[PDB]
Design a protein around this nucleic acid. Structure first.
Ligand SMILES: C[C@@]1(F)[C@H](O)[C@@H](COP(=O)(O)OP(=O)(O)O)O[C@H]1c1cnc2c(N)ncnn12
Ligand SMILES: [Cl-]
Ligand SMILES: [Mn+2]
Ligand SMILES: [Mn+2]
Ligand SMILES: [Mn+2]
Length: 534
RNA sequence: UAAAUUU
RNA sequence: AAUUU
């Protein structure tokens, strides 16, 4: 029946001017050569994104869906949740959050300026007194960096972000925040993926894998999941929120926000014109993440039941899931995934790329990452998390007047410290750069480079400094991504690392600790590394 | 724009 | 601040 969007025809305009690369990239031109492949998505491409996300939805539910939906509500009723004092909600606003149309921004909100507090009270009044008038939203194209990919189109068109004014964002938090903190875990138990750390997510996947007699795994993602959300899904989302114990005042707000904001509304471009109308998920709302995850979980568990997946063990993070189950032979397994995918499609959550059963944990990707294995110091298998380095390397080379990528290097160094690509490429380059700038003591996004060894031990285990014998997949992929971006091959990084290492040792202090721990892989005479006080 | 995780 | 979705 219903259509995800409708368009006035007005353009999707830019928040401000969009930054462009320069003829020299001083920080990254030693990292990689092919800067022509590094691009940032712009509003210029917004029109194309709109076409791909505008389409007719038809949903057909069934006993399996209904049964799951029932069970989820008997779980939701164990949750009691409170309102948030207008003030408490203001304090959860992020520092640089986009300012309101009504002459105040986040400085004012977080500091509880009177004008801001007053407007907000007024907006929350209106939610209580009017449960129908659509709330207007702004639509913008997100600016994100990527490496080109001819196999999949050349250059991706920009994601569309749709969000209400700042006043409404706070009110949302008042009504819903406590719920967002309690509901998912109460509904999905151990299947709620955002609860876990990267290490726990690995322990969990392995425990699941291990406890089957004959494991079969797969992953599923939905194509433009936000468009696939039906008006009805969003209302079913409401009724799940209401299953909790709630202040009467919340209920009225939840319902008002549902009917006015969440199921749809008009859209205005940054220059002010009417741009279109919306009958699906808005990316910009508080319930976007919770809602996606619950809704995906409902459909997925229903589909599991439609398709006969035996003994499923799930993991859901938004529209991304992994099911680990007992194989029924490859013949039946292939049949059931086909079924799973039909069921999901009938529920209006069709796949980007249809899924496939797999029988090796390394071959299951989800959230653009996967589990792999290498050998540890004493020769035991050590399982860990990694990904295609293509994007991180591309983002590593995004240098603009306004933007430096050094923060991104560090972010990826920490998150992925056991990965061969971090250890040989990013680390070498990061430390090489700061040594020459002579800025190791300096703080990057409130982290001290010289704390890395400690930081990494806390997070990844001392094994992170001594791992070796990486998988064929991981070696092939790293090699292939450095070749793709015109970076030196690993052998060259081996050389650079030795040099960096020696230089770091020269300086003594914490610098030499970094030199010895982070770069021990690079030497012939590997020094025995023990735990670190810090 | 929203959230989660990491610091 | 980073990353993910
Ligand atoms: C907008 C989304 F709902 C998106 O559809 C959903 C699934 O992620 P993905 O599978 O990567 O993207 P599509 O399925 O939409 O192609 O997660 C939310 C999402 C992703 N990114 C952002 C963001 N930057 N802000 C807010 N929400 N959001
Ligand atoms: Cl070991
Ligand atoms: Mn998706
Ligand atoms: Mn209601
Ligand atoms: Mn996804």
């Amino acid at each position: 029946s219903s259509m995800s969007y409708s368009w006035t025809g007005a353009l999707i305009t830019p928040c401000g001017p969009e930054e462009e690369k320069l003829p020299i990239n001083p920080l990254s031109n030693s990292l990689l050569r092919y800067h022509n492949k590094v691009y940032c998505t712009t509003s210029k491409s917004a029109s194309q994104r709109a076409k791909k996300v505008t389409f007719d939805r038809t949903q057909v539910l069934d006993a399996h869906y209904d049964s799951v939906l029932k069970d989820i509500k008997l779980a939701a009723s164990k949750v009691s949740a409170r309102l948030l004092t207008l003030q408490q909600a203001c304090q959860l606003t992020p520092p640089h959050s986009a300012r309101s149309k009504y002459g105040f921004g986040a400085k004012e909100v977080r500091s509880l300026s009177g004008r801001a507090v007053n407007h907000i009270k007024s907006v929350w009044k209106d939610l209580l007194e009017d449960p129908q008038t659509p709330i207007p939203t702004t639509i913008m194209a997100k600016n994100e960096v990527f490496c080109v990919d001819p196999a999949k189109g050349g250059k991706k068109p920009a994601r569309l972000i749709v969000y209400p004014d700042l006043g409404v964002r706070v009110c949302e938090k008042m009504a819903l925040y406590d719920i967002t903190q309690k509901l998912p875990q109460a509904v999905m138990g151990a299947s709620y993926g955002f609860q876990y750390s990267p290490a726990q997510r690995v322990e969990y996947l392995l425990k699941a894998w291990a406890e089957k007699k004959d494991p079969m795994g797969f992953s599923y993602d939905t194509r433009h999941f936000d468009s696939t959300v039906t008006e009805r899904d969003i209302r079913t989302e409401e009724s799940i929120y209401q299953a909790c114990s709630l202040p009467e005042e919340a209920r009225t707000a939840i319902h008002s926000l549902t009917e006015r904001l969440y199921v749809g509304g008009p859209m205005f471009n940054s220059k002010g014109q009417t741009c279109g109308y919306r009958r699906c998920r808005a990316s910009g709302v508080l319930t976007t993440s919770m809602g996606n995850t619950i809704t995906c979980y409902v459909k997925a568990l229903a589909a599991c039941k439609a398709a006969g997946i035996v003994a499923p063990t799930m993991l859901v993070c938004g529209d991304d899931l992994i099911v680990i189950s007992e194989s029924q032979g490859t013949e039946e397994d292939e049949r059931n995934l086909r079924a799973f995918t039909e069921a999901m499609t009938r529920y209006s959550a069709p796949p980007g790329d249809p899924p496939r059963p797999e029988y090796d944990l390394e071959l299951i990707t989800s959230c653009s990452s996967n589990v792999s294995v290498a050998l540890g110091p004493r020769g035991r298998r050590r399982y860990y998390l990694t990904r295609d380095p293509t994007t991180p390397l591309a983002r590593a080379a995004w240098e603009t007047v306004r933007h430096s990528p050094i923060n991104s290097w560090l972010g990826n160094i920490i998150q992925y410290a056991p990965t061969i690509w971090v250890r040989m490429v990013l680390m070498t380059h990061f430390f090489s750069i700061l040594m020459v700038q002579d800025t190791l003591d300096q703080n990057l996004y409130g982290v001290n480079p010289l704390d890395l060894p400690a930081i990494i031990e806390r997070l990844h285990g001392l094994d992170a400094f001594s791992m070796h014998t990486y998988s064929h997949h991981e070696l092939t992929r790293v090699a292939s991504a450095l070749r793709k971006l015109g970076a030196p091959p690993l052998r060259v990084w081996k050389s650079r690392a030795r040099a960096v290492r020696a230089s770091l040792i020269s300086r003594g202090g914490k610098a030499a600790v970094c030199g010895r721990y982070l770069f021990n892989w690079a030497v012939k005479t590997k020094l025995k590394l023990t735990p670190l006080p810090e």
